[PDB]
Amino acid sequence: LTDLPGVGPSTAEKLVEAGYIDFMKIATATVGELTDIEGISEKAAAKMIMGARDLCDLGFKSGIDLLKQRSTVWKLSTSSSELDSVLGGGLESQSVTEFAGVFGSGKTQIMHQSCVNLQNPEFLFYDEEAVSKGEVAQPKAVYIDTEGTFRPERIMQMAEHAGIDGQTVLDNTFVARAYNSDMQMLFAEKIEDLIQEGNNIKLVVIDSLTSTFRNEYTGRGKLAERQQKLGRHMATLNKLADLFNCVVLVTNQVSAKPDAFFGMAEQAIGGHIVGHAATFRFFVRKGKGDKRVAKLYDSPHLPDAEAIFRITEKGIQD
């Protein structure tokens, strides 16, 4: 921290108390959020921000550099060949991918399966040149349970079938039971503290992303209030995925209100704010028995595609 221009041991002690130890945290901070700190002036604030941006080499990039920035994105396998394919390889770090769908479509199963696959090094796809082994060593996950449906038994079960040690997954997965939107948002914000404490958080799950907001801001005459809170939450999930190069996953519910992308009739809740904020948007449907269909309907560079898979005692497979 003292490498930053206009930063001595005192200011450095103040920056750490305020939770600003990461250079990126500072390079992407505002002179406003920094001044809220004690003896940190406006000039000293702006100087360190410029210093951090610089040290982090945050400027104009072109040519081959653009490809290298993109190479820092590692992906998490979903245990489904078709799904990973449709995903362009797997679940992307530095992005928010949402799985919306009818009850029992397996949104929760996907969140669980992921926490498990995150503990199998061969399920993290990356380019050693851009992403070092250390950066993805001892990966941990954060599961923000919004409805109370986290199931350790399922983690254990899915773990065994993967040939992994269930308890090992439970030991490297933090679970936070959120009872409302306020808790949900604060838990997400405190994920930095888990990292600050040495936890290599590489997976973040918000299940469910919207159920709380919808129950709290029922009268659509407060929809603006909801959209606002929800928008701040989403920005936090996005910045989190970027700075700590981890994958963020969220589940969403669907409403009767139509929205034809084909057969359709339903649509993920959360309105526009969720739509714009989510990097990859899926619609999971149920087929015969344990058959499921995940329909990718929005992403920045991939075409819309359906992926077929199943939910068995093993978790996700095929």
Ligand SMILES: Nc1ncnc2c1ncn2[C@@H]1O[C@H](COP(=O)(O)OP(=O)(O)NP(=O)(O)O)[C@@H](O)[C@H]1O
């Ligand atoms: N141990 C298991 N063995 C086989 N199938 C299972 C097992 N556990 C769960 N399932 C399947 O998973 C389905 C439920 O998946 P789930 O992830 O809860 O869907 P969901 O989208 O999260 N539902 P909801 O949150 O209410 O909208 C069940 O109804 C079972 O068919």
Ligand SMILES: [K+]
């Ligand atoms: K249910």
Ligand SMILES: [K+]
């Ligand atoms: K549920």
Ligand SMILES: [Mg+2]
């Ligand atoms: Mg991103």
Ligand SMILES: [Mg+2]
């Ligand atoms: Mg669920």
